[PDB]
Design a protein around this ligand. Structure first.
Ligand SMILES: Nc1nc2c(ncn2[C@@H]2O[C@H](COP(=O)(O)OP(=O)(O)O)[C@@H](O)[C@H]2O)c(=O)[nH]1
Ligand SMILES: [Mg+2]
Lengths: 331, 173
């Protein structure tokens, strides 16, 4: 279809991705900023985040080396060469069954064991933060998205309900775990200071957000002062889990098409995320202006986003982007 | 104008602070919690002797990282503390002197009601923390001990009773 919108967008992505020698990264960024067809997300996300080589002939040998390195790290980790860090192993253990509790995928034992490996290897390789709660959330958009590559297009929508074991052999699961591990590593390198002792990364971001909202919406800011609403009472979770806890997984996945294009190595993740949060907060300004302290905190910890479409999130992202430009000369 | 009282629930990750506070607030046990990130806010209106009071419950994240990061500046203007440990986990009981020390040195009051709640007593075979050990501890810090289950349906009127105890205290200046 030239008149069918999803078919035409897929076609434009094929033109950039398919039958090329070197995939043009700037062309892929421009298009992806505006949403990535679900058929294309696993490959595009990997390219954008800097994991998968843009030179297509390098790709097979690269992944082979990265997937074997992850296997060698598993082998070393579960052997007498590694003394298990029990507090870390245990904190991840007790977070996993509490990760995305209302998505059936996450209660499969196979999925839980995958996430345990990814998160524990990440944590023992990053001793300045260790594992910090909320990083279990951040691994899952990559995990679930990368799984969809292993599904026929017509079952991509069932990814939340099928046990990976029923359509992937163990070796494929290990391959997906590697990719998830290396891509989670690239994400977290963008925001290191967020999870070290004291979480200064988050505290800076919340201050930056306070000051942005004072500038862009002074009335909302003054109302918050009048009611003793502190930004930290709702925005700490916004930074720690990158808004994952305020949206449905489908909205998060779509928003990450844009985060990965925006930050593909052009803005930093920390900076763009604060603009997003300012745009998200100001979206509710009207309802919020009439609210007392308990109403504000309850609402901003349970925002009404369950029915948001890709177009709801697109409008938020484009407003963040515009503000990022407009309200740039502001420290 | 109702009087509003701020109560914070503190203790190690996974001991059941969110389940307990869900009982305080909704008489229900949430069987699919997420790991709490930051500090969850919940309100309960209580009528006591013809006065309507508002109980604001701050359910905290219990990982050390967050503790030493920010829990400290959710300690302002608090009216009562619920300390929580998991009766099946001795370590969670052993973190309690550090939680207490954290309260003292990040605060401006000592005569505030506090309680100590040992949770998960339905795991009868797995209980590691004998009552006598916990009572001595509670006695030392001059606060009442309750051993209970947020999950056991046979206990929920009891949990409601534990929560009314602190409501009553607060209401009496
Ligand atoms: N058996 C049992 N499990 C409980 C009880 N209270 C909480 N839990 C469980 O312990 C785990 C952690 O609970 P949660 O409230 O999220 O821990 P938190 O980190 O302190 O908030 C969850 O799986 C809960 O279902 C209880 O009284 N009995
Ligand atoms: Mg909790």
């Amino acid at each position: 279809q030239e008149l069918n919108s999803i078919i035409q967008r897929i076609s434009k992505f094929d033109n950039i991705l398919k039958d090329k020698t070197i995939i043009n990264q700037q062309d892929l960024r421009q298009i992806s900023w505006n949403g990535i067809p679900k058929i294309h997300r696993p490959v595009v996300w990997k390219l954008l985040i800097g994991y998968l080589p843009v030179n297509t002939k390098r790709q097979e040998g690269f992944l082979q080396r990265k997937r074997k390195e992850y296997r060698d790290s598993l082998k070393h980790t579960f052997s007498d060469q590694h003394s298990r860090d029990i507090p870390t192993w245990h904190q991840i253990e007790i977070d996993i069954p509490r990760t995305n509790p209302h998505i059936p995928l996450y209660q499969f034992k196979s999925v839980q064991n995958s996430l345990q490996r990814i998160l524990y290897l990440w944590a023992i390789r990053h001793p300045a933060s260790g594992y910090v709660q909320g990083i279990n959330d951040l691994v899952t958009p990559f995990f679930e998205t990368f799984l969809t590559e292993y599904l026929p297009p017509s079952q991509i929508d069932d990814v939340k309900i099928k046990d990976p074991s029923t359509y992937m052999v163990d070796e494929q699961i290990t391959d997906l775990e590697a990719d998830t591990f290396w891509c989670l590593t690239k994400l977290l390198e963008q925001i290191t200071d967020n999870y070290i002792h004291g979480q200064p990364g988050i505290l800076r971001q919340v201050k930056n957000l306070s000051q942005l909202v004072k500038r862009i919406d002074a009335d909302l800011y003054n109302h918050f002062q009048n009611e003793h609403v502190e930004f930290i009472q709702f925005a700490f979770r916004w930074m720690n889990c990158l808004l994952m806890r305020e949206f449905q997984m489908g909205t998060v996945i779509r928003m990450w098409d844009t985060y990965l294009s925006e930050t593909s190595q052009q803005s930093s993740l920390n900076e763009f995320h604060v603009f997003v949060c300012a745009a998200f907060l100001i979206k509710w300004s009207d309802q919020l202006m009439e609210m007392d302290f308990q109403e504000t905190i309850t609402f901003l910890q349970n925002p009404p986003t369950k029915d948001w479409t890709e177009t709801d999130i697109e409008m938020l992202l484009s407003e963040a982007f515009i503000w990022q430009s407009l309200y740039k000369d502001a420290t | 104008r109702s009087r509003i009282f701020k109560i914070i629930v503190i203790g190690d990750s996974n001991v059941g602070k969110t389940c307990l506070t869900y009982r305080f607030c909704a008489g229900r046990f949430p069987d699919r919690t997420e790991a709490t990130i930051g500090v969850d806010f919940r309100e309960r209106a209580v009528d006591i002797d013809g006065e309507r009071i508002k109980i604001q419950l701050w359910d905290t994240a219990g990982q050390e990282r967050f503790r030493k990061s920010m829990v400290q500046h959710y300690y302002r203007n608090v009216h009562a503390v619920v300390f929580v440990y998991d009766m099946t986990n001795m370590a969670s009981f052993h973190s309690l002197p550090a939680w207490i020390e954290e309260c003292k040195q990040h605060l401006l009051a000592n005569d505030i009601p506090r309680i100590l709640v040992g949770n998960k007593c339905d795991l009868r075979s797995a209980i590691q923390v004998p009552t006598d050990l916990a009572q001595k501890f509670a006695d030392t810090h001059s606060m009442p001990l309750f051993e209970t289950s947020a999950k056991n349906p046979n206990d929920n009127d009891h949990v409601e009773a534990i929560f009314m105890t602190l409501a009553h205290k607060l209401k009496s200046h």
